[PDB]
Design a protein around this ligand. Structure first.
Ligand SMILES: NC(=O)c1ccc[n+]([C@@H]2O[C@H](COP(=O)([O-])OP(=O)(O)OC[C@H]3O[C@@H](n4cnc5c(N)ncnc54)[C@H](OP(=O)(O)O)[C@@H]3O)[C@@H](O)[C@H]2O)c1
Ligand SMILES: O=C(O)COc1cc(Cl)ccc1C(=O)NCc1c(F)c(F)c(Br)c(F)c1F
Length: 316
């Protein structure tokens, strides 16, 4: 299987990337350096992760070392919810570019479909704990994203955590100039996303699977939640293939024509997670993994559930 997938902007995107949410700032520079050394060419970032400066130090060092050329890297970031307004989008993108020490992004995503009140706080709340919306809509935010392409700041634009109706809304936008290249969504054997993936793929939008290992380090994890990495059924498939459970969990989305972005700051795991291009899951393995769906989400948030554009009320 090829290492890159063709996007609808004509560029190629590496199907395996390194995630950086929760990667501590004192560890992520080394994580990204190791990742590039062992073959990663795609890094998934976001302003809200609060570590783009440190990710950027690694990228810049490897460019300076001539370990890789800029054209060989595929750097992704995301517009945070408090920057959905017309007059804030460019500055938000530029702050990310400055922190990453880049002059363009390969892909810039609307991080969530919901706009929040601008200000210092990433999650502005009312006194009862509800997020404070902005009156921005996804269509006007999309127009602002299109401007970034036309200014040379980003090579591709896309969306993240958009449900099928929200994706449709963008595709049906009056005067749409650039289609979204990517929809980045949670996807793993407990949240298999067949419906949304089929819709996006049918429209030529590439899907990136986040939290492919079930995000065991998510800060809201409870001791009782289901655990992909410990599921004996998945362990059995891994054993049959002489691979680790994580390697199976990474290979799974790859064979569905998805991009996948496992996170690690552990050098041995960063390397392990990349060793997924030399085995194949059978069709029976794939269907068996799909059968584990339970509609379980890592990534949901009670404080945002009343926002008009909260994505997870819809079935898909
Ligand atoms: N667009 C969005 O809204 C959104 C939401 C969630 C995630 N994302 C992106 O997707 C990335 C991945 O998702 P995620 O960070 O939620 O979780 P994940 O990649 O599913 O899991 C990360 C966890 O798995 C551990 N791990 C990694 N490789 C392992 C291995 N080979 N064996 C055992 N454990 C392993 C990591 O530990 P160590 O790091 O300690 O090694 C970490 O605790 C994020 O970092 C972010 O870039 C985007
Ligand atoms: O969003 C990510 O990439 C990973 O998760 C996070 C990362 C950071 Cl640094 C802070 C918070 C989160 C988190 O609570 N995510 C869930 C989450 C939602 F479910 C949602 F519906 C809306 Br809207 C959100 F804004 C939102 F944040």
């Amino acid at each position: 299987m090829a290492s890159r997938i063709l996007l609808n902007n004509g560029a190629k995107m590496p199907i395996l990337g390194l995630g950086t949410w929760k990667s501590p700032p004192g560890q992520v520079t080394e994580a990204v350096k190791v990742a590039i050394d062992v073959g990663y060419r795609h890094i998934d970032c976001a302003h809200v992760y609060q570590n783009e400066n440190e990710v950027g130090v690694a990228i810049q060092e490897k460019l300076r070392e001539q370990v890789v050329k800029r054209e060989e890297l595929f750097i992704v970031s995301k517009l945070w919810c408090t920057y959905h307004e017309k007059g804030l989008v460019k500055g938000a993108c530029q702050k990310t570019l400055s922190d990453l020490k880049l002059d363009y992004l390969d892909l810039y995503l609307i991080h969530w479909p919901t706009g929040f009140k601008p200000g210092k706080e990433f999650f502005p709340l009312d006194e009862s704990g509800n997020v404070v919306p902005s009156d921005t809509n996804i269509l006007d935010t999309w127009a602002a994203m299109e401007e970034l392409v036309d200014e040379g700041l980003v090579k591709a634009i896309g969306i993240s955590n958009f449900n099928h109706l929200q994706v449709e809304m963008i595709l049906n936008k009056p005067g749409l100039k650039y289609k979204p290249a990517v929809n980045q969504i949670e996807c793993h054997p407990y949240l298999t996303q067949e419906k949304l993936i089929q819709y996006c793929q049918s429209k030529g939008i590439v899907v990136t699977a986040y939290s492919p290992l079930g995000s065991p380090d998510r800060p809201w994890a409870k001791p009782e939640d289901p655990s992909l990495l410990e599921d004996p059924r998945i362990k059995a498939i891994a054993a049959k293939h002489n691979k680790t459970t994580a390697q199976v969990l990474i290979r799974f989305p790859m064979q569905r024509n998805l991009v996948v972005i496992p996170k690690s700051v552990t050098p041995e795991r960063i390397a392990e997670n990349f060793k997924v291009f030399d085995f194949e899951l059978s069709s029976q393995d794939m269907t068996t993994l799909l059968s584990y769906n339970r509609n379980w989400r890592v990534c949901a948030l009670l404080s945002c559930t009343s926002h008009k554009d909260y994505p997870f009320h819809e079935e898909f």
